[PDB]
Amino acid sequence: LDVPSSSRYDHRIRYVTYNPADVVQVDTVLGVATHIMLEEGEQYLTHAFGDSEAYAFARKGRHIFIKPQAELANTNLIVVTDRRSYKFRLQMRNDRNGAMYELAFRYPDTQARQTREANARAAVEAAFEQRVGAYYNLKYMMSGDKDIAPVNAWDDGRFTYFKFSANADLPSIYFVDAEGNESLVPRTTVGSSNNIIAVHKVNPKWMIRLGNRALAIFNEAYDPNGVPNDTGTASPAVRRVNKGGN
């Protein structure tokens, strides 16, 4: 038998943590309608009173109200829901004092979840921004139409970057294999002013087009081997583990 604890503002508001292996004491006086909290997204199946005529049960979704309509009603409630089954031990109090207006719950495993996940997300974001252990290759040539030439170009073994000044127009970037065909690589834009076009590969030759203006980019320090992507993400400091289970 658990007992809810009084809140620090008014004793008619009390909280108790759900516990599957114990019952919860409910102390109701006559003439008060106590409102049970049921946690968000819970699916009611059926309930069962010790005395169906002792207390008035009304449910609107996940809200449960209880009110005595019988003298000397010492009974119990067993509500089975989506996941858990709540156990109550209703007791009438004849003083008409110290009522509970509502009963709200605390769920331990849930809080163990959210508190862990917030720390995990903060750590992940910190790891991404704290990038360390990287080398950069800066040897790139152009050939062609310099009107749309980027102001800088490099790579980090995994991503190839381009930077355009404020007044230029972001062209498209095309994969060029050895034979000479052009093809598409996904691109993302990063940077404070979105002036950095980042493609997701490293290649000896890039192709830049804007309308009828063309420019070629050569990687004069192509690495056939490169660093393997063993972390499963764009950083060496973050794993990628499976929520899937199964």
């Binding site: 040539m141 102001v151 009828n212 070629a216």
Partner: peptide, 28 residues
């Protein structure tokens, strides 16, 4: 006796370096 025109391949003569200055974002 005709086919799709191909986009202009840039010439390969006035090849020059791209990064006249070192990029700032490199923290260098």
């Amino acid at each position: 006796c005709a086919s799709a025109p191909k986009p202009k391949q840039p010439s390969d003569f006035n090849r020059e370096p791209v990064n006249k200055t070192v990029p700032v974002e490199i923290q260098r």
